[PDB]
Amino acid sequence: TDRDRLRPPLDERSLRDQLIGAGSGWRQLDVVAQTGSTNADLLARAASGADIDGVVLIAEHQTAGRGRHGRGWAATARAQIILSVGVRVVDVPVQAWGWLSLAAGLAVLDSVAPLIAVPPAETGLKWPNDVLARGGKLAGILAEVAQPFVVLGVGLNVTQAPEEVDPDATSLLDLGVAAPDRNRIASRLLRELEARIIQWRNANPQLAADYRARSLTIGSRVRVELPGGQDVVGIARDIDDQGRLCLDVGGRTVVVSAGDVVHL
């Protein structure tokens, strides 16, 4: 397609020089031409004994991507920022691990927000793992547990056309960013991510506060599709200390640990 001219490759050397060294917590960064799933790859490293804390894996293309709840993730080469990072979590109470996922979405949003000229309506965070812009899914986040680690995965649509991946998707290009630079965006993303991970590890109240400020879900009428197929309709009110969504259902509180949110 014509978007190929807007998709130059990543510069691995430059990313390493920016992100590895004094002042940074990232220990390793690799760019691979392609793989099945960056999340699976880092999980596999950990499963064979690797210390993956602060390890970054970026793929130009991903052929067997994973979404939440056994779903998939679609991509074409060089159209997204596709990455996974390792996070040691055993030092943090297990009940707080759900916030690491929310923190990642916040980091992704903050990394790309200033690139848009004028933010259209419905731009922000949808619980529990969506970055939305103009109602479209700009990025998806997947967290997978492999004690003592969590592997955090990010799929961010940079020039990816919705016709290539999913009808409800959007990208920076489709949001009016004419020539997005994936090298600059990747660096910004990883720096934002480091800060949010540190905040999460230290239970900094600003993490929850900043998330709330960018939430599209809180205050909205929602239908939540639960694991198992059930739907619950209510109004989202808050996120608890476990990262769970708190719903007002006719005056009753229903707290949801996992589900698919539709804003009504």
Residue with token string 């769970």: 244
d(CA 74, CA 66): 9
Pairing of strands 260-263, 221-225: antiparallel
Q: How far is the CB of 204 from ligand 44K (least distance, A)?
A: 25
Please, which residue, 106 or 253, has the CB nearer to ligand 44K? 106
Please, which residue, 155 or 234, has the CB nearer to ligand 44K? 155
Q: How far is the CB of 203 from ligand 44K (least distance, A)?
A: 25
Please, which residue, 37 or 215, has the CB nearer to ligand 44K? 37
Please, which residue, 38 or 217, has the CB nearer to ligand 44K? 38
Q: How far is the CB of 57 from ligand 44K (least distance, A)?
A: 9
Query: Which residue has the CB atom at the shortest distance from ligand 44K?
Result: 140
Q: How far is the CB of 32 from ligand 44K (least distance, A)?
A: 12
32: closest CA among 4, 8, 61? 61
d(CA 73, CA 182): 19
Q: How far is the CB of 26 from ligand 44K (least distance, A)?
A: 17
Q: How far is the CB of 201 from ligand 44K (least distance, A)?
A: 22
Please, which residue, 133 or 195, has the CB nearer to ligand 44K? 133
Please, which residue, 66 or 78, has the CB nearer to ligand 44K? 66
Q: How far is the CB of 104 from ligand 44K (least distance, A)?
A: 10
Binding site for ligand 44K (CB under 6 A): 37-39, 65-69, 71-75, 82, 84, 129, 137, 140-142, 153-155, 157, 160, 165-166, 169
Please, which residue, 30 or 248, has the CB nearer to ligand 44K? 30
